[PDB]
């Protein structure tokens, strides 16, 4: 189990590390936004690039990543274009996406960049092999937004992250039920005690799965997602109160 | 599923219910651990009296359930005399131990008492019909304090339970592994799913299962145990930190 240092934060030992999204249309509402959030405590800032309007230029991309990194210099920071088919809220063609995670990796302004597996195996292995050249890590994600696949299609799919080259895997998926919450927690603990060699972020989404954003500690997920104060739907839960149940279940 | 009323207090809904145990060797240091308690916040006082040393009197057991009861007037108290077989602290003949919840039982002076499953079932179901007919509420217990049984194994002896008339049935067990917790978990799940018509409470004992006792809400266990104040041994939690990771977990 290799961990995964950014900055001075080590993910995959201790408790699990606490991820805020910050989301803005243009420059000006993500410096907004970035000095509300240098005023809450978190571990690492996630920039949901596809909130971001102009999207088409590289440089306004890179000139809003700049803003952030000024108001918060020592935060780890991974930069996200969640596409629409997982969730997200724009959708660009591959060869756009490609070009703006290169872009971001080229800045040197971010530490992480968020993959999607489901980009196409050639595309996320040639931008895994460009980031680790370039010093930047890689969480590679999975998304359902709709259901919670078997145990063992989500573990074959953390597993092909990995090999893949991931330094980071990341899936998020809906639970239908509550047993579909138990299906999540047990395809964590099954990597996390036999084919992890690195950090796996897993969450069950929405109200029912807020459990598996709590007890990461327990069953191997290394980082959770919380709100920058105000939660306003049912399953955010705010950063103070995220973290302290991680104390409290850290020290127990 | 039908709800346990005492006091004021609705056991199955809403929030867990946390239950604390008072443990005292004589009438003074019960009478100066029951000044203590009241000055803490919980719902559900238990009196382990397998902890008293005199329970071949049964006038003294009934003096220090008064002791109790006048320093907190309005608790639900639970009776409980846990047998050494299930860890408790002294081993007292089958008869004895019917006859001290009897005598609780006719006191007036708790509202329920705790019956270990394996005591024999003619035995069990007396007491139960018994305490039934004196308004005394029955939590039907079992603790294996070595292992984790089967989930099939623990759905069918809290069925068992529910069948000898317990309103209340209470499994405690201990992890050996990760996976044991989630035995439990899934054994709660299935019960609150498709067996119990009553409140139940399940709970993995040590560090590793204190997540059991903080998830109730979500899977199906009724009520928790926290400890007053300072909370010693790894996996005890104190009734305050529990108290705020279950309103977060209700609120979220």
């Given at each position: 189990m290799k961990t995964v240092t950014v900055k001075n934060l080590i993910i995959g030992?201790?408790?699990?590390?606490?991820?805020?999204?910050?989301?803005?249309?243009?420059?000006?509402?993500?410096?907004?936004?970035?000095?509300?959030?240098r005023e809450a405590t978190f571990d690492i800032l996630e920039w949901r690039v596809d909130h971001?309007?102009?999207?088409a230029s590289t440089q306004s991309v890179l000139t809003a990543a700049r803003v952030i990194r000024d108001a918060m210099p020592d935060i780890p920071l991974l930069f996200t274009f969640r596409s629409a088919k997982e969730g997200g809220e724009?959708?660009?063609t591959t060869q756009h996406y490609l070009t703006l995670n290169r872009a971001a990796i080229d800045s040197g302004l971010v530490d992480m960049i968020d993959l999607e597996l489901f980009t196409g195996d050639a595309?996320?292995?040639?931008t895994v092999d460009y980031a680790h050249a370039h010093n930047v890590y890689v969480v590679m994600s999975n998304h359902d937004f709709h259901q919670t696949p078997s145990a063992e299609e989500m573990v074959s799919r953390l597993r092909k992250m990995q090999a893949l080259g991931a330094d980071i895997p990341k899936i998020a998926v809906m639970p239908q039920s509550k047993h579909?919450?138990?299906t999540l927690l047990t395809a964590t603990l099954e990597m996390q005690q036999h084919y992890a060699d690195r950090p796996v972020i897993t969450m069950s989404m929405a109200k029912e799965g807020?459990?598996?954003?709590?007890?990461?500690?327990?069953?191997?997920s290394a980082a959770t997602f919380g709100a920058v104060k105000q939660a306003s739907a049912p399953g955010q839960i705010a950063v103070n109160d995220l973290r302290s149940v991680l104390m409290i279940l850290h020290n127990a």
């Open positions: 030992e201790g408790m699990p590390k606490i991820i805020v999204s910050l989301m803005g249309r243009d420059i000006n509402s993500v410096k907004a936004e970035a000095l509300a959030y971001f309007m102009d999207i724009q959708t660009i595309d996320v292995k040639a579909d919450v138990l807020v459990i598996s954003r709590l007890a990461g500690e327990v069953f191997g």
